[PDB]
Design a protein around this motif. Structure first.
Motif, PDB file in Angstrom:
ATOM      1  N   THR A  57      15.017   1.462   1.973  1.00 35.54           N
ATOM      2  CA  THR A  57      14.433   0.831   3.156  1.00 35.54           C
ATOM      3  C   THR A  57      13.941  -0.550   2.729  1.00 35.54           C
ATOM      4  OG1 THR A  57      13.600   3.036   3.655  1.00 35.54           O
ATOM      5  CG2 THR A  57      12.929   1.254   5.126  1.00 35.54           C
ATOM      6  N   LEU A  58      14.261  -1.601   3.483  1.00 34.71           N
ATOM      7  CA  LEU A  58      13.920  -2.959   3.051  1.00 34.71           C
ATOM      8  C   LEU A  58      12.964  -3.681   3.980  1.00 34.71           C
ATOM      9  CD1 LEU A  58      17.495  -4.096   1.968  1.00 34.71           C
ATOM     10  CD2 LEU A  58      15.559  -3.583   0.464  1.00 34.71           C
ATOM     11  N   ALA A  59      11.889  -4.227   3.412  1.00 35.83           N
ATOM     12  CA  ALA A  59      11.087  -5.233   4.094  1.00 35.83           C
ATOM     13  C   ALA A  59      11.639  -6.602   3.704  1.00 35.83           C
ATOM     14  CB  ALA A  59       9.612  -5.116   3.717  1.00 35.83           C
ATOM     15  N   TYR A  80       0.599 -10.697   4.915  1.00 35.64           N
ATOM     16  CA  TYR A  80       1.232  -9.452   5.342  1.00 35.64           C
ATOM     17  C   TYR A  80       0.766  -8.240   4.575  1.00 35.64           C
ATOM     18  CZ  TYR A  80       4.377 -12.856   7.422  1.00 35.64           C
ATOM     19  OH  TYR A  80       4.893 -13.901   8.145  1.00 35.64           O
ATOM     20  N   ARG A  81       0.998  -7.077   5.171  1.00 37.95           N
ATOM     21  CA  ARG A  81       0.818  -5.803   4.498  1.00 37.95           C
ATOM     22  C   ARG A  81       2.073  -4.968   4.680  1.00 37.95           C
ATOM     23  NH1 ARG A  81      -3.740  -4.189   6.513  1.00 37.95           N
ATOM     24  NH2 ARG A  81      -5.023  -4.797   4.697  1.00 37.95           N
ATOM     25  N   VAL A  82       2.560  -4.410   3.580  1.00 31.53           N
ATOM     26  CA  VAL A  82       3.653  -3.448   3.609  1.00 31.53           C
ATOM     27  C   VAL A  82       3.071  -2.099   3.244  1.00 31.53           C
ATOM     28  CG1 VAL A  82       5.854  -2.713   2.628  1.00 31.53           C
ATOM     29  CG2 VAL A  82       5.376  -5.166   2.987  1.00 31.53           C
ATOM     30  N   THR A  83       3.195  -1.120   4.137  1.00 31.38           N
ATOM     31  CA  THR A  83       2.648   0.216   3.910  1.00 31.38           C
ATOM     32  C   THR A  83       3.783   1.224   3.817  1.00 31.38           C
ATOM     33  OG1 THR A  83       0.689  -0.378   5.217  1.00 31.38           O
ATOM     34  CG2 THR A  83       1.003   1.959   4.721  1.00 31.38           C
ATOM     35  N   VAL A 112       0.834  -1.196   0.000  1.00 30.15           N
ATOM     36  CA  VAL A 112       0.000   0.000   0.000  1.00 30.15           C
ATOM     37  C   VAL A 112       0.864   1.239   0.000  1.00 30.15           C
ATOM     38  CG1 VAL A 112      -1.804   1.294   1.202  1.00 30.15           C
ATOM     39  CG2 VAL A 112      -1.773  -1.227   1.281  1.00 30.15           C
ATOM     40  N   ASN A 113       0.614   2.152  -0.931  1.00 33.48           N
ATOM     41  CA  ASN A 113       1.321   3.420  -0.933  1.00 33.48           C
ATOM     42  C   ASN A 113       0.503   4.507  -0.278  1.00 33.48           C
ATOM     43  OD1 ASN A 113       3.074   5.502  -1.345  1.00 33.48           O
ATOM     44  ND2 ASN A 113       2.491   5.858  -3.485  1.00 33.48           N
ATOM     45  N   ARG A 114       0.820   4.837   0.967  1.00 34.12           N
ATOM     46  CA  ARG A 114       0.135   5.935   1.654  1.00 34.12           C
ATOM     47  C   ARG A 114       0.924   7.254   1.524  1.00 34.12           C
ATOM     48  NH1 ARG A 114      -1.283   3.849   7.221  1.00 34.12           N
ATOM     49  NH2 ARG A 114      -2.912   2.768   5.992  1.00 34.12           N
ATOM     50  N   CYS A 115       2.035   7.235   0.788  1.00 33.87           N
ATOM     51  CA  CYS A 115       2.785   8.467   0.535  1.00 33.87           C
ATOM     52  C   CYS A 115       1.984   9.393  -0.356  1.00 33.87           C
ATOM     53  CB  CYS A 115       4.128   8.178  -0.142  1.00 33.87           C
ATOM     54  SG  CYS A 115       5.168   6.971   0.723  1.00 33.87           S
ATOM     55  N   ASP A 148       5.934   0.489   7.155  1.00 38.17           N
ATOM     56  CA  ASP A 148       5.404  -0.406   8.166  1.00 38.17           C
ATOM     57  C   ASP A 148       5.278  -1.781   7.515  1.00 38.17           C
ATOM     58  OD1 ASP A 148       2.827  -1.845   9.320  1.00 38.17           O
ATOM     59  OD2 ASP A 148       3.599  -0.545  10.911  1.00 38.17           O
ATOM     60  N   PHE A 149       5.657  -2.829   8.235  1.00 39.77           N
ATOM     61  CA  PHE A 149       5.586  -4.200   7.737  1.00 39.77           C
ATOM     62  C   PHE A 149       4.869  -5.013   8.803  1.00 39.77           C
ATOM     63  CE2 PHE A 149       8.526  -7.912   6.110  1.00 39.77           C
ATOM     64  CZ  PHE A 149       7.437  -8.587   5.595  1.00 39.77           C
ATOM     65  N   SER A 150       3.604  -5.359   8.556  1.00 35.16           N
ATOM     66  CA  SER A 150       2.773  -6.015   9.568  1.00 35.16           C
ATOM     67  C   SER A 150       2.061  -7.242   9.021  1.00 35.16           C
ATOM     68  CB  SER A 150       1.717  -5.045  10.114  1.00 35.16           C
ATOM     69  OG  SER A 150       2.306  -3.999  10.868  1.00 35.16           O
ATOM     70  N   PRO A 151       1.861  -8.255   9.869  1.00 35.25           N
ATOM     71  CA  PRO A 151       0.977  -9.360   9.478  1.00 35.25           C
ATOM     72  C   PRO A 151      -0.484  -8.908   9.374  1.00 35.25           C
ATOM     73  CG  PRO A 151       1.476  -9.506  11.797  1.00 35.25           C
ATOM     74  CD  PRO A 151       2.312  -8.360  11.267  1.00 35.25           C
ATOM     75  N   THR A 152      -1.241  -9.535   8.479  1.00 34.09           N
ATOM     76  CA  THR A 152      -2.693  -9.311   8.399  1.00 34.09           C
ATOM     77  C   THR A 152      -3.448 -10.485   8.989  1.00 34.09           C
ATOM     78  OG1 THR A 152      -2.755 -10.200   6.142  1.00 34.09           O
ATOM     79  CG2 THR A 152      -2.600  -7.792   6.392  1.00 34.09           C
TER      80      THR A 152
END
Length: 207
Positions: free
Chosen positions: A86-88, A199-202, A6-9, A113-117
């Motif tokens: 920056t690396l996930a 996962y979600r990477v934001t 997800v690009n929230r930038c 942000d790198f989070s489990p869903t």
């Protein structure tokens, strides 16, 4: 496994996903502000990475350049990108577990942000203004904040002998983002998740 990217930038980024010798899913895509891209990563994938690229120009054939994170001039990345990135990072289904982290070992370009869903573990985030606060000698002209190994190419910064300590440069990244790797032998900030989590990477999680 499913990854939603997800690009929230407020600016466009070109997401990339690779395991170093191959693309993951399509390997890359443009994400305008607010857009989401869902990819499918094969179980057992070891050493996968997701990152953002900034200020890219691609022709119709998917060939071009980016100012950060360029992967050999391709829209669809097959190899890892040029620092600063920056690396996930993730390894999936390793003896029943998934392992995830964020790393600044190759510098920083975009907050993440790198989070489990799915349930069973926590996420990690590096969302400080590392580019704004970047030490002068690490600033990248194209944008971003390089790591010291990229800039100075010494055994100590690159940890070439397998012996190295923290440095004034690594401590800068660690102060601003304690939950991300700041040098090769940093105390691990890896999170252990149940095998086959999603996962979600934001990008730009706070802005």
């Amino acid at each position: 496994a499913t990854f939603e990217i997800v690009n929230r930038c407020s600016y466009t980024v070109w997401a990339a996903a690779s395991k170093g010798d191959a693309a993951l899913d399509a390997g890359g895509r443009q994400l305008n502000s607010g857009e989401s891209w869902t990819i499918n990563v094969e179980p057992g994938t070891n050493g996968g990475k997701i990152w953002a690229r900034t200020d890219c120009y691609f022709d119709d054939s998917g060939s071009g350049i980016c100012k950060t994170g360029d992967c050999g001039g391709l829209l669809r990345c097959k190899r890892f990108g040029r620092p600063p990135t920056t690396l996930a990072e993730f390894s999936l289904n390793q003896y029943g577990k998934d392992y995830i982290d964020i790393s600044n070992i190759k510098g920083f370009n975009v907050p993440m942000d790198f989070s489990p869903t799915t349930r069973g573990c926590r996420g990690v985030r590096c969302a400080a203004d590392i580019v704004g606060q970047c030490p002068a000698k690490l600033k990248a002209p194209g944008g971003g904040c390089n790591d010291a190994c990229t800039v100075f190419q010494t055994s100590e910064y690159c940890c070439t002998t397998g012996k190295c300590g923290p440095t004034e440069y690594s401590r800068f990244f660690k102060r601003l983002c304690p939950d991300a790797f700041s040098y090769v032998l940093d105390k691990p900030t890896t999170v252990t998740c149940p095998g086959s989590s999603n996962y979600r990477v934001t990008f730009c999680p706070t802005a």
